């Protein structure tokens, strides 16, 4: 052949979001989170027009419960923690 390439459409796609030590609490990094990552909905893909970039039209805030596992203490601490996940619902190629 080879088979012609199909452009990656500007649309919502299942992505993996890493639950980072920085965003929720900034006290230090030496605390582990469970689960370490979760699935999210994001805008990914390309635009046919040059000038344009793929962008979210509207987002949805989704809170989830995780656990903070503090290691650098006299004893282990397994604390509940809420993390706000940003999900994209619609994507469109926008003028810039």
């Amino acid at each position: 052949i080879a088979e012609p390439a199909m452009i990656a459409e500007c649309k919502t796609r299942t992505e993996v979001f890493e639950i980072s030590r920085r965003l929720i609490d900034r006290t230090n990094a030496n605390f582990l989170v469970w689960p370490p990552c979760v699935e999210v909905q994001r805008c990914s893909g390309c635009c046919n027009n040059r000038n344009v970039q793929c962008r979210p039209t509207q987002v949805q805030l989704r809170p989830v419960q995780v656990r903070k596992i503090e290691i650098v203490r006299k004893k282990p601490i397994f604390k509940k923690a809420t993390v706000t996940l940003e999900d994209h619902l619609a994507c469109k190629c926008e003028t810039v």
Epitope: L32, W34, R67, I69, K74, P76, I77, F78, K80
Partner: antibody, heavy 120, light 106 residues
Framework: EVQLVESGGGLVQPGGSLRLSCAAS????????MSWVRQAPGKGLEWVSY????????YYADSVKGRFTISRDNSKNTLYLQMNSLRAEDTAVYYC?????????????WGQGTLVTVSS | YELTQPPSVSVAPGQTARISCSGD??????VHWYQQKPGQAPVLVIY???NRPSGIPERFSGSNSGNTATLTISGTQAEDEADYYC?????????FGGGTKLTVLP
């Protein structure tokens, strides 16, 4: 059949030392975090020490800090507790217990316990 | 500090036993419950506030919110007579509560 068996308990003098052992069987001992929990006669449960699945992280209660040492031999499927500078208040039944998850503090499996009496 | 439990709870057979456990911001931590019969090792009856391990009867249920965790035993039988210990790994030095002895009337 999943099991934990403590040994090494006995009568000991104050300021003396004792090493406790805990033999694990029926499961992969290396994949689990472990704790020592003690119970004075007629009294309640007191967490003593915690050890990571690999032995990297070791935690102690303030009542045993500087005197007790936790360790493990994953090749032998054995948990250890080295108790030095023993005091009458250290008299208890010593339990060996398994944390089913690295991210959890609950205790899945317990041994039958080993009695340590500290007296002059 | 300390995880506070009533030293004893008395109930009539078939009634609902409620054993409390109090600690500073306890609701923001995971609470486990252990059942201990004389001469026996503790048994995990509830983990992570409300979860029952396999082999634990439906009678046992738990909750944790705010400052207090509660163990609930509906349809209390003679075989439920034991010492109950709450447990949590928090910022305070005590991993276990003082215990509650559950007794069945008369």
């Amino acid at each position: 059949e999943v099991q934990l068996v403590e040994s090494g308990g006995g009568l000991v003098q104050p300021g003396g030392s004792l090493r406790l052992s805990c033999a694990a069987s029926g499961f992969t001992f290396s994949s689990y975090a472990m704790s020592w929990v003690r119970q004075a006669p007629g009294k309640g449960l007191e967490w003593v020490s915690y050890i990571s699945d690999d032995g990297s992280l070791k935690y102690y209660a303030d009542s045993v800090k500087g005197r007790f040492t936790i360790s493990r031999d994953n090749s032998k499927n054995t948990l250890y507790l080295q108790m030095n500078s023993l005091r009458a208040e250290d008299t208890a039944v010593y339990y060996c217990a398994r944390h089913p998850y690295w991210y959890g503090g609950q205790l899945d499996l317990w041994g039958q316990g080993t009695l340590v009496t500290v007296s002059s | 500090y300390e995880l506070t439990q009533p030293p004893s709870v008395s109930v009539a057979p078939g009634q609902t036993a409620r054993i409390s456990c109090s600690g500073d911001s306890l609701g923001s931590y995971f609470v486990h419950w252990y059942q201990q019969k004389p001469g026996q090792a503790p048994v995990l009856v509830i983990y992570d506030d409300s979860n029952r391990p396999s082999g634990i009867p439906e009678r046992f249920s738990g909750s944790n919110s705010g400052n207090t965790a509660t163990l609930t035993i509906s349809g209390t039988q003679a075989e439920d007579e034991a010492d109950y210990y709450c447990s949590a790994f928090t910022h305070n030095s005590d991993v276990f509560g003082g215990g509650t002895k559950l007794t069945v009337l008369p």
